[PDB]
Design a protein around this nucleic acid. Structure first.
Ligand SMILES: Cc1cc2nc3c(=O)[nH]c(=O)nc-3n(C[C@H](O)[C@H](O)[C@H](O)COP(=O)(O)OP(=O)(O)OC[C@H]3O[C@@H](n4cnc5c(N)ncnc54)[C@H](O)[C@@H]3O)c2cc1C
Ligand SMILES: O=c1nc2n(C[C@H](O)[C@H](O)[C@H](O)CO)c3cc(O)ccc3cc-2c(=O)[nH]1
Length: 502
DNA sequence: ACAGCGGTTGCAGGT
DNA sequence: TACCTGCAACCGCTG
């Protein structure tokens, strides 16, 4: 018959390096038998208005919550998956559980800002102590903004100068095994259903299981650490890691693929940073930022900082960084790009892997992002943002929007002369086109001399490869060698228009 | 002041 | 091999 401490999961679905969670566990064990602990995850049915979520990411979260519960079970506790909106949920669970303190990890995203504010205001009303922690990113965006005179650095090299003169926080371990902690007595919901706050099953979470692809990347903290240690095994590979040197179209990932685990917070970026630093010190010949592996982690930190200031970071209108470009509507060309039926086998192969597996390589994301926007189709990056938002396992509001602005040359990147060739780009790393053959099996019998460009081969040859254009594989919707030059001139025109105002 | 430099990852043609 | 200059040219940051 006592008060309750609460940790609230949103991002940071881990035990390791969770100062918000450890602060609960250390305090509860400081006064044993005086508290109840409720590690909660609010299954908010309001994020659906905020973001598109595909089947693949729902599977990831299902596996994450299942692992988080298993990890919490070993600490004499458990997870509580509460259904309903926080604005409705909190008032009830504050009184019924009798909550004294509530902790959670901070998030810059607009949905959280309005949510975290409304929660903390109500906490002040109900006499609930709230102390938040900043552990999703290595550096606090506000402090970076502050030390750069109340504004965010709009270049990478300037950003590096601001962050290097800041203290790197202590990476924490796993919280203590709860001493003298019985199961909290069943509330109004738990009495009416014992399994009310249990982990949502696949059926409960994934509404359309036919959209699910192969489960190549299982969710959870356990897999995150496991995959990290596997990636850090070859220290030679880690040290000399240079991003442009990595292939976009290799069958098995040329990079670590820790981004989904960093997005959900199954892996601590601080720990990953700390682990990388240690290897660097044991390796003489090592790569330096931005191309380095730590540099890649710094890019995450970079996009998180600029987005912290601008709430309209995901849209063109009202965005302080985004170049105002008259993008054209074309639902026909949009539907084709979204489902990988453009007629460009390299672009289609990437988009099909994105739909099926839920992850694609950085330079593979580059090729498609350029093609849709300033490259060929001249379609707004906001459209491709939603496609990525739905299909990506690592869908990060800040990272998704920022990198889309990079490739559309709306912000940060400005050299619109550098346009990716959907025909040539893939050839360098994959001359045979194995990647195309796997994800576009229609063209698997085509020779390497015209697999990136089927329109080059005669009809009599098309029949001989068991794939005729127009039926078995769509005609190329636009002509790259023509459209990209016209788009270059369009980019220069809009670059003047924005320059005029300033 | 305007002007040189650097900018995660262009392409084609060349050595 | 890994880097050579054309292409006609952007932005922010620097002194
Ligand atoms: C149009 C577009 C949209 C993108 N959307 C997302 C997204 O929503 N979420 C996301 O995590 N990444 C996004 N990326 C960035 C990048 O493609 C991925 O982070 C990377 O390919 C994931 O593979 P990895 O984990 O092996 O990265 P690694 O090469 O292993 O890099 C290490 C870590 O650094 C981070 N990182 C790498 N590249 C970037 C970068 N370009 N910007 C910011 N952080 C980076 C990732 O979290 C990654 O886990 C996007 C890129 C483009 C071009
Ligand atoms: O608080 C929650 N946040 C959820 N978010 C997590 C989200 O990243 C954080 O809540 C952010 O802090 C919101 O801006 C999700 C994100 C996804 O990409 C996919 C599914 C979810 C589900 C939830 C959820 O149920 N509850």
């Amino acid at each position: 018959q006592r008060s309750t401490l609460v940790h609230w999961f949103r991002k940071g679905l881990r035990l390791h390096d969770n100062p918000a969670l450890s602060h609960i566990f250390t305090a509860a064990n400081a006064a044993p038998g005086r508290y109840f602990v409720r590690p909660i995850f609010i299954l908010d049915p309001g994020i659906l208005d905020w973001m598109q979520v595909g089947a693949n990411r729902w599977r990831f979260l299902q596996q994450t919550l299942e692992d988080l519960d298993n990890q919490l079970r070993k600490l004499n506790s458990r997870l509580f998956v509460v259904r309903g909106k926080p604005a409705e949920v909190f008032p009830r669970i504050f009184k019924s559980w009798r909550v004294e303190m509530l902790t959670f990890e901070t998030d810059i995203e607009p949905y959280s800002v309005t949510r975290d504010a409304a929660v903390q205001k109500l906490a002040k009303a109900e006499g609930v102590r709230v102390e938040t922690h900043c552990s999703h990113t290595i550096y606090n965006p506000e402090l970076v903004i502050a030390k750069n005179l109340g504004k965010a650095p709009i270049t990478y090299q300037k950003f590096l100068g601001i962050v290097e003169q800041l203290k790197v926080p202590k990476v924490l371990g796993v919280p203590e095994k709860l001493k003298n902690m019985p199961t909290p007595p069943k509330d109004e919901v738990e009495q009416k259903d014992s399994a009310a706050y249990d982990c949502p099953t696949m059926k409960q979470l994934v509404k359309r299981p036919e959209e699910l692809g192969p489960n190549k990347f299982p969710g959870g903290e356990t897999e995150a650490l496991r995959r990290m240690e596997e990636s850090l095994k070859d220290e030679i590979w880690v040290a000399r890691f240079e991003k442009p040197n990595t292939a976009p179209n290799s069958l098995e990932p040329s990079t670590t693929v820790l981004s989904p685990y960093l997005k959900f917070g199954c892996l601590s970026a601080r720990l990953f940073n700390q682990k990388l630093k240690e290897i660097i010190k044991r390796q003489p010949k090592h790569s330096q930022p931005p191309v380095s592996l730590i540099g890649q982690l710094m890019w995450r930190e970079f996009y998180y900082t600029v987005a912290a200031a601008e709430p309209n970071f995901d849209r063109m209108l009202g965005n302080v960084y985004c170049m105002q470009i008259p993008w054209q509507e074309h639902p026909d060309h949009l539907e084709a790009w979204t489902h990988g039926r453009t007629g460009y086998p390299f672009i289609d192969a990437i988009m099909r892997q994105l739909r099926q597996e839920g992850w694609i390589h950085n330079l593979a994301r580059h090729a498609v992002a350029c093609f849709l926007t300033r490259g060929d189709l001249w379609i707004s990056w906001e459209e491709g943002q939603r496609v990525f938002e739905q299909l990506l396992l690592d869908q990060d509001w800040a990272l998704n929007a920022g990198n889309w602005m990079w490739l559309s040359a709306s912000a940060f990147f400005h050299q619109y002369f550098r346009v990716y060739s959907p025909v040539a780009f893939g050839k360098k790393t994959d001359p045979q086109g194995h990647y195309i053959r796997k994800y576009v099996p229609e063209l698997s019998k085509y020779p390497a001399g015209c697999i990136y460009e089927p329109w080059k081969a005669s009809l009599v040859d098309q029949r001989a490869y068991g794939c005729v254009l127009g039926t078995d594989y769509p005609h190329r919707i636009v002509k790259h060698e023509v459209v990209h030059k016209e788009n270059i001139k369009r980019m220069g025109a809009a670059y003047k228009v924005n320059r005029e105002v300033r």
